[PDB]
Write a protein that binds this ligand. Structure first.
Ligand code: CL
Ligand code: NA
Ligand code: NA
Ligand code: ZN
Ligand code: ZN
Ligand code: ZN
Ligand code: ZN
Ligand code: ZN
Length: 279
């Protein structure tokens, strides 16, 4: 009974059932995509725990219920007309019995393409295009502002802390890499480009961190406690970027994401942080 999406064939996108063109009750089970759906003015009736913990996105989905993919009863009761999932979810068959499902395989389309792809799926091309045009202009302008401070050839490394572990990231695995590397066009150290960029992420022992940091480091964490021991260590304090105050500590609860809402916050935050590194 619903008007249907044209359901274009797009790398990484799989449809289960007849996708509505204008869904009225969307359940997002993939925090990667929730904010894209919000930017295109979808009514989100269910979202993930990560979405509720994203302090930027959460403000826009207060009426949505938090659900997990296993919550077949709760999701059914929300009466969705569309469910959105990542391709690694394991009960897509059961979910597709409740409502049509869009399943997206991460990384097959870039962080901007995902928005225009949803524009095609939902016939919201104008909303997507206007956002993307503004993003292109704004990021080019901000690139000039930040490189006026650092110089054009400064190297950046994207890092994240989780529990006792340290990770490096490339240009397309969140933690600010899309903005730093794709939008501001900052280079990375050679070792990061060689060892990290293709896979997208790399687990590292803390003792080798100096070898992967050049001019600046952006470090994501979910709380202030996680990095405290690292930051106080002689190892960390010996790194030139640390001595120069070129460490930018960011809130992973928003910086994991690449949706438009999260990105807008991240962009202003990173611009201001680079300016502030010379206080
Ligand atoms: Cl932050
Ligand atoms: Na994803
Ligand atoms: Na400053
Ligand atoms: Zn049908
Ligand atoms: Zn059944
Ligand atoms: Zn550039
Ligand atoms: Zn957590
Ligand atoms: Zn400086």
């Amino acid at each position: 009974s619903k008007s249907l999406s044209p359901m274009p064939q797009i790398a990484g996108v799989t449809y289960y059932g007849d996708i509505p063109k204008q869904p009225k009750r969307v359940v997002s089970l993939a925090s990667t995509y929730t904010g894209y759906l919000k930017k295109l003015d979808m009514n989100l009736v269910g979202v993930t725990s990560y979405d509720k913990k994203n302090p930027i996105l959460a403000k826009t989905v207060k009426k949505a219920k938090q659900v997990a993919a296993t919550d077949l009863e709760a999701i059914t009761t929300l009466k969705p007309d569309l469910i959105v999932v990542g391709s690694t979810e394991e009960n897509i068959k059961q979910l597709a019995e409740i409502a049509p499902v869009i399943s997206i395989e991460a990384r097959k389309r870039d962080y901007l393409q995902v928005l225009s792809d949803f524009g095609r799926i939902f016939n919201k091309e104008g909303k997507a295009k206007k956002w993307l045009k503004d993003w292109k202009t704004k990021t080019a302008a901000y690139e000039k502002e930040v490189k006026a401070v650092t110089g054009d050839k400064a190297t950046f490394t994207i890092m994240g802390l989780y529990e006792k572990d340290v990770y490096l990231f490339g240009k397309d695995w969140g933690r600010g890499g899309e903005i730093i590397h794709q939008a501001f066009h900052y280079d990375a150290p050679e070792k990061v480009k060689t060892e990290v960029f293709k896979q997208g992420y790399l687990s590292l022992s803390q003792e080798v961190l100096p070898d992967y940091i050049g001019d600046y480091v952006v470090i994501a964490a979910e709380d202030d406690k996680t990095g405290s021991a690292l930051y106080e260590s002689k190892l960390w304090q010996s790194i030139p970027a640390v001595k120069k105050h070129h460490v930018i500590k960011v809130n992973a609860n928003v910086f994991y994401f690449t949706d438009p809402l999260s990105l807008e916050y991240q962009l202003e935050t990173l611009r201001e942080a680079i300016l502030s590194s010379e206080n």
